[PDB]
Amino acid sequence: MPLDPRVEQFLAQMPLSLAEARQQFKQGALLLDQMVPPPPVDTEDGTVVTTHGPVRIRRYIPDRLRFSHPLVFYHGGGFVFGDIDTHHGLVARLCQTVGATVISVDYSLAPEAKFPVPVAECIDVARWAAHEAPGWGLKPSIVVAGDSAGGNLAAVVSQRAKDESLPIAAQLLFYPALDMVHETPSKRDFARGYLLEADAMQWFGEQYLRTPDDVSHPWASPALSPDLTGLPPALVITAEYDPLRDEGEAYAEALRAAGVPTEQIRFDGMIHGFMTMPIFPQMEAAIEAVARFLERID
Ligand SMILES: CCCC(=O)Oc1ccc([N+](=O)[O-])cc1
Numbered sequence: 001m002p003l004d005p006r007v008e009q010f011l012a013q014m015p016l017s018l019a020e021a022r023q024q025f026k027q028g029a030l031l032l033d034q035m036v037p038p039p040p041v042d043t044e045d046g047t048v049v050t051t052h053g054p055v056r057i058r059r060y061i062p063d064r065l066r067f068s069h070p071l072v073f074y075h076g077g078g079f080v081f082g083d084i085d086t087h088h089g090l091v092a093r094l095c096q097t098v099g100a101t102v103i104s105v106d107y108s109l110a111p112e113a114k115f116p117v118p119v120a121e122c123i124d125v126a127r128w129a130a131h132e133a134p135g136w137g138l139k140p141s142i143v144v145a146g147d148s149a150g151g152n153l154a155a156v157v158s159q160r161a162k163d164e165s166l167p168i169a170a171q172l173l174f175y176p177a178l179d180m181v182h183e184t185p186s187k188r189d190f191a192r193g194y195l196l197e198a199d200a201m202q203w204f205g206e207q208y209l210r211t212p213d214d215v216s217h218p219w220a221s222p223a224l225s226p227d228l229t230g231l232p233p234a235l236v237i238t239a240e241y242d243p244l245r246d247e248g249e250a251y252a253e254a255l256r257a258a259g260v261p262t263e264q265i266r267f268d269g270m271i272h273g274f275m276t277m278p279i280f281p282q283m284e285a286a287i288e289a290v291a292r293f294l295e296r297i298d
């Protein structure tokens, strides 16, 4: 199916120290937010004590609370880039459109922290949120969410939840990375030219993982886990022209066949990252998909 027209234009107009590349990634996100300002939203900064140190968070409070579970959101950026500010545009809209409290998490970035530190941190924040939820007038079961690398973290947290005594009501995976071991057709075919590229993904893995053997670890590659029974209800959103598409859709099919309530939505003509790119109407359509999915959770 053809590239979305606006996506095609964006790709057509596209043209370093670690610090410079981080700043560049942040300038890119600010630019998009200037083009399509986020909705106003009440927020409160805070810090969660985790097993790997303090982790900054931002709690988003909807104008009108309509959803009975807190969302815990883990930003993407290949485990190296991104923060609460880069993902504000998405989180503010999730909060106001769903009508949910959202905890946005500033987990520790690679290469300064390596696998599996961010996983641990993200588990700890999820547990904190479950504990706090009654004091917010909410159910203790949380919804975890993330894009890309953040979708990886949401998926892994979801797999660890029962063993970690963590009540999780649902998982929202936005074009997640899930399998660092296997080539898929999409990973081969869309490896260059669609914003997320092969060589970038290799580099991210080099920064995040301790050794190449870590690719086979289920906390890096959750798609490898043989038993998906009993995992939380899943919304899995993919982009058609995304190297990560195929592993996302395959994981959704495996969840479904393991009896997990699963909604799988591919946005045709779209690319990786579209849910933090408000120049595309499909970002808000996907956020509407989230609200409609969460309506069904109870
Ligand atoms: C937001 C982008 C997330 C991303 O590309 O994360 C990845 C990190 C490593 C691998 N890999 O080693 O294959 C893939 C994705």
Ligand SMILES: CCCC(=O)Oc1ccc([N+](=O)[O-])cc1
Residues within 6 Å of the ligand: 180, 201, 202, 205, 206, 207, 209, 210, 211, 212, 213, 215
């Ligand atoms: C996508 C695979 C990336 C990978 O193999 O990551 C690493 C490679 C080499 C080292 N190392 O030996 O330091 C660590 C991770």
